[PDB]
C-alpha cells in the first residue's frame, strides 16, 4: 500500500482509507499480532518506507492516526489527554521517531539523498516540526552558539598569526626569544591544529554518510568547503616544511576561504539563514548561466581586439591576458575607451568596443538583475524549508556528537500511560504533548484520559 | 547585506594584506589601506593594479577577481532584487505606519498647546 501511494489527492485518500481498514481488520482477527512492526528485506517498516520514499500523505496520516473505536484504540498514535473548554491537550506517540531507534523517521528524512521527491516538506508535519523546535530550544542552541564562538576565536587567531609572518629568508624560520615570536608560534600551531581537526571531521563525515557521487556534488556544499580549507592548510604546512616559499599562497587561500565559510553559522538564525539559502540558490543558477554567456562574449571580443592590435611604430597591450583584463574593467565601471593606440583602423576598434559595451554592460548585467528579481519572487517558501532542513541536520549531528556527555539525558517527550493493551496490561509510551484551542467545535462528548484537566 | 558584505570584505582584505610583502600610493602593507582599496570596487572605482609588491601575481589577481565576482556582481544585484521584493510586500503597511506617525504628531501637538486652547479646539459638538 505504501509503495502504491504517489501523493495525489484521490490516491492518498484511498491509500489511507485502505490502510486504516486493513489495520482494523488485522487488529480484530489477531489482537496479539503487531502488523506495523514487520519489516521487508531492506529492514524498513511501512512508516520508515513511507518516510524514505517521500510519500508525504501516508506519513502525515500515520503520524496523526486517531482511532476512536473502543475495541481497537491502542492502534492510535494521537490521543486527547484532556479538554476543559475550547482547550485540548493532545499526545503524539514518538515510538520510532526520536532518534533512539536503529533508523528513526527523523534521521531517515534528514539524511535523504535529495533524490527523494519532497524531503523539504516532510518536516512540516506537526509532531516532527514541534519536536525539532523543542530539541533546538532545550539544549542544542547553546552548543551551536559555543561552536560559533570557538570558530570565531580560531579565525581571529589564524588571521593574527598569518598577518605577522616573517619575511626575511626562507622557511622554516628559527624561533626567537621575543615574546611576540612565542605568541606567533602559538598561533601558527593552533591554526595547524584546527586545519587537521577539520580534515578529520570531513573524513569521518564521508565515512559515516557514505554519500553518492551525485549527492557528493549536489548536497554537501559546506562539508566540501571546510574540507577544501583544511586541505589548503595542510598543503601550506607541507610546503612550509619543504623550504618552498609558495606556502604563502595556500595559506592565503585557506584564510580567505575560512573567512567566507564563517557564513555557515547563519543557519542558527531564521532571517540570516534564509538569506544565505537565497545566496546559494542565486550562485547555483543565475551566476552560472550569466558567467557562461559573459565569458563567451568576453573571450570573443578580446581575441578580436588583440588580433586587431599591431603594437609597432600601460604598454605592450599585444597580449591576450592584458586585453582580456582591459575589457573586463568595463564590467566593473572602470573601462577606458582609449587604452591603446597601436592599431591601423580606429573605426574598427571603436566599433568593436562599443559593441562589446552594449552587449555585456547595458544588456547582460541588467538582465541578470531582472532574473535575480524573478528568482527571488519564485523561491520565497522553498528557502525557508531548506533552512529548516539545514537546522534539522545541525540538530541531528549535534545530538550524535554528544552521546558520551548525555546519551539519553536529553530525550524528547516523557513516558506516559495512554490506555490498556487488549491483553489487559498497561500501555506506556514516550509521548510528546501539544496544546490547542478551538471555538467552533464545542464538543463535550469525546474520549479523554484524565478526569482533571490541568497538568500538575 | 552589510553584515554579509563586511564579512566578505574583511576576509579578502586580510588575505590580500598577508599576501603583500612591501619590499624591494605607497606602503600598501596596511590593513586599513587594503580595506579601503577593496571597498573602492563597490562604488565603481576599483583599481585592479593598485600595487605590485607581491611575489605571486596569479594569487593576487585570482583573489581580486573572486572578491569582485562575489561582492559586486552577486551581492549588490541581489540586494536590488530583495529591495524590489520588499517594496512589493509593504505597500499598505507603509500607509498604515504613516497614519500612526501623523496620529502621534496630532496627539503631541494637542497636548503641547493646552495653555493656548485647553478645550477651544474640541472635536464634535
Ligand atoms: C561554490 C559554490 C557552492 C556554494 C553552495 C552553498 O552556498 O552552500 C552553502 C554554503 O555555506 C557556506 O559554507 C558559506 C559559503 C558561501 C559561498 C562561498 C563562496 C565560495 C568560496 C569562494 C572562496 C574564494 C577563495 C578562493 C551551504 O550549503 P549546505 O552544505 O548546507 O547544503 C544545503 C543542504 O544541506 C542540502 O540539504 C541541500 O540539498 C543543498 O541544496 C544545500 O541547500
Ligand atoms: C577547544 C574546543 C574544541 C571543540 C569545539 C568545536 O567543535 O569547534 C568547532 C570550530 O573550532 C575548530 O574547528 C577549531 C579547533 C581549534 C581550537 C583553537 C582555538 C581556541 C580559542 C565548531 O565547528 P563544527 O560545528 O565542528 O563544524 C562546522 C562546519 N561543519 C564541519 C559542520 C561543516
Ligand atoms: C584572542 C586574541 C587574538 C588577537 C591577537 C593579536 C592582535 C593584536 C596584535 C598587536 C601586536 C603589536 C606588536 C608589533 O607590532 O610587533 C610585531 C609582534 O606581533 C606579534 O608577533 C603578535 C602576533 C601573534 C598573534 C597570535 C595570537 C595567539 C594567542 C593565543 C612584530 O613586529 P612588527 O615589525 O610590528 O611586524 C611587522 C608586520 N607588518 C606590520 C609589516 C605587517
Ligand atoms: C555568539 C552567540 C550569539 C548571540 C545570540 C543572539 C540571540 O539570542 O538572539 C537572536 C538574534 O536575532 C536574530 O534573529 C538575528 C540576530 C543575529 C544574526 C547574526 C548572524 C551570525 C553569522 C534570536 O534570533 P531568532 O532565532 O530569529 O529569534 C527567534 C525567531 O525570531 C522567532 O520568530
Ligand atoms: C561548473 C558549474 C556548473 C553548475 C550547474 C548547477 O547549477 O548544477 C547544480 C550543482 O552544481 C555542482 O555540481 C557544484 C559542484 C560542487 C561545488 C562545491 C564547491 C545542480 O543543482 P540545481 O538542480 O541547480 O538546484
Ligand atoms: C564558465 C564557468 C561557470 C559556469 C559554466 C556552466 C554552467 C551551465 C549550467 C546552467 C544550467 C543548469 O543549471 O543545469 C541544471 C543542472 O544540470 C546539471 O546538474 C549539469 C551541470 C554541469 C555543467 C558543466 C539542469
Ligand atoms: C570561453 C572560451 C574559453 C576557452 C577557449 C580556448 C581557445 C584558445 C585559443 C588560443 C589563442 C592563442 O594562440 O593564444 C596564445 C595563448 O594565450 C594564453 O596565454 C593562453 C590561452 C588559453 C585560454 C583559455 C581561457 C598566445 O599567447 P602566448 O603564447 O602566451 O604569448 C604569445 C607571445
Ligand atoms: C556602423 C557605422 C559605420 C560607420 C564607420 C565609418 C566611419 C569612418 C571610416 C574611415 O574613414 O576609416 C576607414 C575604415 O577602415 C575600414 O576599412 C573599416 C570601415 C568601417 C565600416 C564597417 C561596418 C560593419 C559593422 C579607413 O580609413 P583610415 O585609414 O582609418 O583613415
Ligand atoms: C553609442 C554611440 C556613442 C558614441 C559614438 C560617437 C558618435 C558618432 C559621430 C560620428 C562623426 C565621425 O565619424 O567623425 C570622424 C571619426 O569617426 C571615427 O573615428 C569612428 C566613428 C564610428 C562611430 C560609430 C559606431 C557605432 C556602432 C556600434 C555597434 C571624423 O572626425 P575625427 O576623427 O574627430 O577628426
Ligand atoms: C567582520 C569582522 C570584524 C572584526 C574581526 C576582528 C579580527 C581582527 C584580527 C587582527 C589582525 C591584526 O593583527 O591587525 C593589526 C590591527 O589592525 C588594525 O588596525 C585594527 C584591527 C581591528 C579590526 C576590526 C574591524 C595590525 O595593524 P596595526 O598593528 O595597526 O599596524 C601594524 C604595524
Ligand atoms: C581558477 C583558475 C586557476 C588557473 C590559474 C593559473 C595560471 C598561472 C599559474 C602560474 O603562473 O604560477 C606561478 C606561481 O603561482 C603559484 O605559486 C600558485 C598558482 C595558483 C593557481 C592555483 C589556485 C587554485 C584556486 C605564477 O606566479 P610567478 O611565479 O610570479 O610566475
Ligand atoms: C572574469 C575573468 C576576466 C579576465 C581574466 C583574464 C583572462 C585569462 C587569460 C589567461 C592567459 C595567461 O595566463 O597569461 C599569463 C599571465 O597570467 C597571469 O598572470 C594570471 C592568470 C589568472 C587569471 C584567471 C583567474 C580566474 C579565477 C576567478 C575566480 C602569461 O601572460 P603575461 O603574464 O601577459 O606575459
Ligand atoms: Na566608475
Amino acid at each position: 500500500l505504501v509503495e502504491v501511494a504517489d501523493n495525489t489527492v484521490d490516491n492518498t485518500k484511498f491509500v489511507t482509507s485502505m490502510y486504516n481498514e486493513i489495520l482494523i481488520l488485522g487488529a480484530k482477527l489477531h489482537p496479539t499480532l503487531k502488523l506495523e512492526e514487520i519489516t521487508n528485506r531492506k529492514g524498513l517498516t511501512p512508516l520508515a518506507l513511507a518516510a524514505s520514499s517521500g510519500k508525504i500523505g501516508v506519513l502525515a496520516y500515520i503520524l496523526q492516526r486517531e482511532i476512536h473505536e473502543p475495541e481497537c484504540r491502542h492502534l492510535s498514535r494521537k490521543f486527547t489527554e484532556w479538554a476543559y473548554g475550547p482547550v485540548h491537550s493532545s499526545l503524539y506517540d514518538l515510538s520510532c521517531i526520536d532518534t533512539c531507534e536503529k533508523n528513526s523517521v527523523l534521521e531517515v528524512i534528514a539524511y535523504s539523498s535529495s533524490e527523494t521527491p519532497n524531503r523539504h516538506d516532510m518536516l512540516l508535519v506537526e509532531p516532527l516540526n514541534r519536536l525539532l523546535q523543542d530539541k533546538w530550544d532545550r539544549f542544542v542552541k547553546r552548543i551551536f552558539y559555543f561552536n560559533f564562538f570557538v570558530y570565531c576565536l580560531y579565525m581571529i587567531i589564524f588571521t593574527a598569526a598569518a598577518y605577522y609572518r616573517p619575511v626575511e629568508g626562507l622557511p622554516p624560520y628559527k624561533l626567537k626569544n621575543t615574546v611576540g615570536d612565542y605568541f606567533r608560534v602559538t598561533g601558527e600551531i593552533l591554526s595547524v591544529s584546527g586545519g587537521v581537526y577539520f580534515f578529520f571531521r570531513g573524513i569521518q563525515y564521508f565515512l559515516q554518510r557514505r554519500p553518492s557521487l551525485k549527492s557528493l556534488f549536489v548536497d554537501s556544499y559546506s562539508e566540501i568547503l571546510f574540507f577544501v580549507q583544511s586541505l589548503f592548510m595542510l598543503v601550506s604546512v607541507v610546503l612550509y616544511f619543504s623550504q618552498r616559499k609558495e606556502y604563502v599562497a595556500s595559506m592565503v587561500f585557506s584564510l580567505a576561504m575560512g573567512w567566507t565559510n564563517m557564513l555557515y553559522y547563519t543557519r542558527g538564525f531564521q532571517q540570516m539563514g534564509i538569506y544565505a539559502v537565497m545566496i546559494e540558490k542565486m550562485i547555483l543558477r543565475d551566476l552560472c548561466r550569466f558567467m557562461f554567456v559573459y565569458l563567451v562574449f568576453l573571450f570573443g571580443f578580446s581575441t578580436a581586439v588583440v588580433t586587431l592590435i599591431e603594437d609597432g611604430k600601460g604598454n605592450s597591450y599585444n597580449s591576450l591576458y592584458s586585453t582580456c583584463l582591459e575589457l573586463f574593467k568595463f564590467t566593473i565601471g572602470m573601462g577606458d575607451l582609449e587604452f591603446t593606440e597601436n592599431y591601423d583602423f580606429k573605426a574598427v576598434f571603436i566599433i568593436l568596443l562599443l559593441a562589446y559595451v552594449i552587449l555585456t554592460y547595458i544588456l547582460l548585467l541588467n538582465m541578470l538583475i531582472a532574473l535575480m528579481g524573478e528568482t527571488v519572487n519564485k523561491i520565497a517558501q522553498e528557502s525557508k524549508n531548506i533552512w529548516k532542513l539545514q537546522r534539522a541536520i545541525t540538530i541531528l549531528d549535534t545530538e550524535k556528537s554528544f552521546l558520551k556527555c548525555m546519551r539519553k539525558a536529553f530525550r524528547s517527550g516523557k513516558l506516559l500511560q495512554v490506555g490498556f493493551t487488549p491483553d489487559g496490561k498497561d500501555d506506556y509510551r514516550w509521548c510528546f504533548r501539544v496544546d490547542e484551542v478551538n471555538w467552533t467545535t464545542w464538543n463535550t462528548n469525546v474520549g479523554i484520559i484524565n478526569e482533571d484537566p490541568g497538568n500538575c
Side-chain angles (χ1 to χ4, degrees), chain A residues 1-9 11-12 14-100 103-125 127-167 169-173 175-177 179-312 314-403 405 409-422 424 426-435 437-439 441-442 444 446-456:
Chain A
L1 272 169
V2 163
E3 284 290 356
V4 163
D6 72 341
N7 304 310
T8 74
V9 177
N11 170 296
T12 297
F14 181 76
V15 170
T16 52
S17 301
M18 181 59 58
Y19 196 101
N20 203 38
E21 290 287 4
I22 296 189
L23 208 58
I24 290 173
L25 266 294
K28 300 191 168 170
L29 299 178
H30 304 257
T32 185
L33 174 79
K34 297 182 76 65
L35 216 52
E36 284 198 298
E37 283 185 14
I38 310 178
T39 63
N40 58 9
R41 299 315 180 77
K42 290 184 183 292
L44 299 175
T45 71
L47 180 51
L49 179 60
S52 72
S53 301
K55 312 292 175 57
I56 191 164
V58 175
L59 181 69
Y61 154 81
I62 290 173
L63 295 182
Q64 312 160 7
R65 163 151 45 79
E66 197 169 7
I67 293 178
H68 303 285
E69 201 289 336
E71 156 53 6
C72 48
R73 183 170 169 270
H74 56 286
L75 305 175
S76 293
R77 269 184 155 265
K78 179 180 182 180
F79 311 85
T80 295
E81 187 179 18
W82 58 262
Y84 185 75
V87 191
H88 292 351
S89 80
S90 310
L91 303 182
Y92 292 88
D93 192 323
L94 272 54
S95 292
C96 290
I97 298 168
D98 194 13
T99 70
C100 310
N103 58 350
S104 54
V105 165
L106 183 63
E107 175 173 352
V108 160
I109 300 165
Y111 294 168
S112 302
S113 50
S114 175
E115 294 293 328
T116 77
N118 61 6
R119 63 172 188 161
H120 309 305
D121 302 324
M122 296 175 78
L123 292 176
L124 302 189
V125 310
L128 303 182
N129 200 241
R130 286 210 164 70
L131 176 55
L132 282 177
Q133 180 74 47
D134 168 61
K135 284 192 172 186
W136 173 263
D137 278 342
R138 278 207 305 100
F139 69 110
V140 300
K141 182 212 298 180
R142 290 168 183 169
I143 304 177
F144 188 82
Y145 290 175
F146 179 73
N147 283 336
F148 184 18
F149 172 83
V150 169
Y151 187 73
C152 281
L153 284 181
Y154 168 71
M155 276 325 288
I156 292 180
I157 297 301
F158 182 15
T159 300
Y163 186 82
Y164 292 106
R165 56 174 185 100
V167 290
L170 286 177
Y173 305 103
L175 186 143
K176 303 205 299 294
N177 296 339
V179 69
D181 185 294
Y182 277 130
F183 270 64
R184 190 183 55 76
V185 170
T186 291
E188 293 179 354
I189 290 166
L190 292 189
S191 313
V192 175
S193 76
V196 57
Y197 168 87
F198 282 124
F199 181 72
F200 278 138
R201 276 217 55 189
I203 289 296
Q204 76 176 359
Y205 162 92
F206 172 86
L207 291 195
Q208 292 183 349
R209 294 285 290 277
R210 299 286 181 168
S212 71
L213 189 65
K214 183 192 180 191
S215 184
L216 196 61
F217 274 33
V218 307
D219 270 328
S220 51
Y221 296 119
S222 49
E223 304 290 343
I224 283 169
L225 292 176
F226 279 81
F227 192 61
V228 170
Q229 177 204 341
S230 60
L231 281 194
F232 272 123
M233 174 61 79
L234 298 186
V235 169
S236 174
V237 171
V238 160
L239 278 167
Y240 171 90
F241 276 116
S242 173
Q243 284 163 346
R244 295 324 307 281
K245 192 140 199 58
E246 285 74 336
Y247 85 96
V248 166
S250 300
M251 182 179 72
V252 175
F253 285 133
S254 178
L255 190 44
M257 185 180 288
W259 270 113
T260 58
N261 281 342
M262 180 87 66
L263 199 75
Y264 158 91
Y265 288 94
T266 52
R267 69 192 52 194
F269 315 87
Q270 172 164 342
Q271 299 299 126
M272 297 304 295
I274 293 170
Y275 187 42
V277 166
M278 298 169 135
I279 288 174
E280 166 199 355
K281 294 305 173 187
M282 301 291 216
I283 288 173
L284 291 179
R285 302 166 192 188
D286 295 314
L287 258 188
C288 284
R289 294 185 304 170
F290 166 86
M291 289 296 311
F292 183 81
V293 180
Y294 171 79
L295 289 177
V296 169
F297 281 24
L298 170 64
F299 190 78
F301 278 103
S302 299
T303 46
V305 172
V306 172
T307 81
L308 185 68
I309 283 165
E310 284 185 353
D311 185 77
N315 206 350
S316 174
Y317 273 108
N318 200 340
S319 176
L320 188 60
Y321 165 78
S322 290
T323 303
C324 286
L325 202 71
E326 284 299 326
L327 293 191
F328 175 73
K329 272 173 205 179
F330 278 88
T331 293
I332 62 170
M334 279 294 275
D336 190 356
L337 277 166
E338 292 103 2
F339 69 90
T340 190
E341 271 169 349
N342 305 333
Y343 63 85
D344 285 2
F345 314 103
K346 182 163 186 192
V348 185
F349 183 80
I350 194 65
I351 287 172
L352 282 169
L353 281 186
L354 270 68
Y356 172 79
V357 160
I358 289 163
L359 277 173
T360 65
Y361 188 76
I362 292 177
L363 173 70
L364 273 176
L365 269 177
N366 304 332
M367 182 197 290
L368 166 72
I369 296 167
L371 288 172
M372 267 162 192
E374 187 71 357
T375 295
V376 167
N377 185 40
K378 184 175 74 69
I379 68 175
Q381 183 56 21
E382 191 194 3
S383 298
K384 186 159 167 51
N385 292 346
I386 295 179
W387 167 67
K388 292 271 197 43
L389 278 174
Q390 290 179 168
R391 206 175 63 164
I393 297 173
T394 296
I395 293 164
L396 294 203
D397 285 8
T398 292
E399 183 178 1
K400 294 220 160 198
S401 73
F402 264 53
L403 80 167
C405 275
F410 310 94
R411 180 173 189 186
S412 296
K414 57 179 71 64
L415 186 65
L416 296 175
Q417 185 181 5
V418 189
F420 301 102
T421 190
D426 293 332
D427 212 341
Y428 270 104
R429 300 187 199 181
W430 277 96
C431 282
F432 183 72
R433 181 185 281 111
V434 184
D435 296 331
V437 190
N438 186 355
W439 295 101
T441 302
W442 294 122
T444 190
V446 299
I448 296 93
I449 290 163
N450 280 4
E451 271 185 349
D452 304 346
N455 290 318
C456 166

